[PDB]
Amino acid sequence: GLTEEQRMMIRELMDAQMKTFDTTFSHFKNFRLPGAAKWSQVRKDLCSLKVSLQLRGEDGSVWNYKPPADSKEIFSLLPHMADMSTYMFKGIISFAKVISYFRDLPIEDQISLLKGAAFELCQLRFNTVFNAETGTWECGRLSYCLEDGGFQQLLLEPMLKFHYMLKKLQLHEEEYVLMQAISLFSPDRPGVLQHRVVDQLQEQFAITLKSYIECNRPQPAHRFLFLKIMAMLTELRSINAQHTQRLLRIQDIHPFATPLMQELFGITGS
Ligand SMILES: CC(C)(C)c1nc(-c2cccc(NS(=O)(=O)c3c(F)cccc3F)c2F)c(-c2ccnc(N)n2)s1
């Protein structure tokens, strides 16, 4: 069983998630849509995603967008993705701010922790709207569908393999929100000062997750689930570092980051 404190911890996380995760994306509006050796790398960077976009109007109409092939056209999706990322990042910041364990840290460590983890928490939330059968992220009236190598070739992209592998674990809402907490409270992000406090908090969240899995998932399929989840969080941190470098290269060639994104990625405006 869980202790009273562990149940309180989960309930506080679940409450924060429900208050700040707009799962239907109803308040995502007014977003933009698609109308030397540095460049080869930036081309390789931009070619790894490849999603088409679908927008279902409230009246029943459907707009569909199919991206081009790399023949400047590789940048046509960046303003839209910047708007989606900014919307998600806002939700993530709200999440952190309604959690008492986070509100209790000094403001400087709050900022450091958010800068370190915003990408990761975004990816964790996107996994809950990922449909692994159709290869699509279902964000309310918006859908992002992976373009057609096959599934095996898709799994070569680490973010995509991450989404398929994590979806396969069939986690509960409580396990997702504890993964978000373990990621947010990482004592080893640059600029963290209360390293010991954050480390103890993280360990508590991880113990709560371990005990929750033990008390509620006895089936042979969920043997080692806790260790699988922690390995996924390690892999997600790696993905975060490579995507940060990728974003900074693209931003160096073709600026696109919003002010919130610039703040989170350490871009100063100078
Ligand atoms: C909706 C769906 C299909 C799940 C996506 N989410 C992101 C995504 C996920 C998390 C954060 C950001 N924004 S971001 O700021 O983290 C960032 C970029 F917007 C662009 C490049 C790297 C990067 F880290 C994203 F764009 C996608 C995405 C698109 C292009 N590049 C990258 N790295 N991610 S695709």
Beta-carbon neighbour count of residue 61 at 10 Å?
8
Solved by what technique?
Answer: X-ray
| H or E element in which residue 84 lies | helix 78-97
Q: Which residue has the tokens 């696109």?
A: 256
Domain carrying residue 59 = 1-270
Q: Are 48 and 154 in contact (CB under 8 A)?
A: no
Whole-number Å distance between alpha carbons of 253 and 181: 34
Regarding the beta carbon of 160 and ligand 1, being less than 6 Å apart is answered: no
Whole-number Å distance between alpha carbons of 254 and 200: 41
Phi, psi of 56 (to 5 degrees): -95, 115
User: How would you classify residue 70: left for phi > 0, otherwise alpha for psi between -120 and 50, otherwise beta?
Assistant: beta
Q: Are 119 and 88 in contact (CB under 8 A)?
A: no
- Give the amino acid at 253: I
Mutate to test the pocket of ligand 1, among 75, 85, 239, 244 (most ligand atoms within 8 A of CB): 85
Phi, psi of 193 (to 5 degrees): -100, -45
Atom of ligand 1 nearest to the CA of 81: 26
User: How would you classify residue 171: left for phi > 0, otherwise alpha for psi between -120 and 50, otherwise beta?
Assistant: beta
For residue 5, what are the contacts with CB-CB under 8 A and spacing of at least 6?
Answer: none
Which resolution in angstroms does this entry have?
A: 2.2
Phi, psi of 127 (to 5 degrees): -60, -30
Q: Is 61 among the annotated ligand-binding positions?
A: no
Whole-number Å distance between alpha carbons of 42 and 150: 23
Q: Which residue has the tokens 């978000």?
A: 180
What is the Å distance from ligand 1's center to 81 Cα?
6
Domains in the chain: how many in total? Answer: 1
DSSP states of 120-172? HHHHHHHHHTEETTTTEEEETTEEEEE---HHHHHTTSHHHHHHHHHHHT---
If we measure between CA atoms, which residue out of 142, 137, 119 comes closest to residue 261?
119
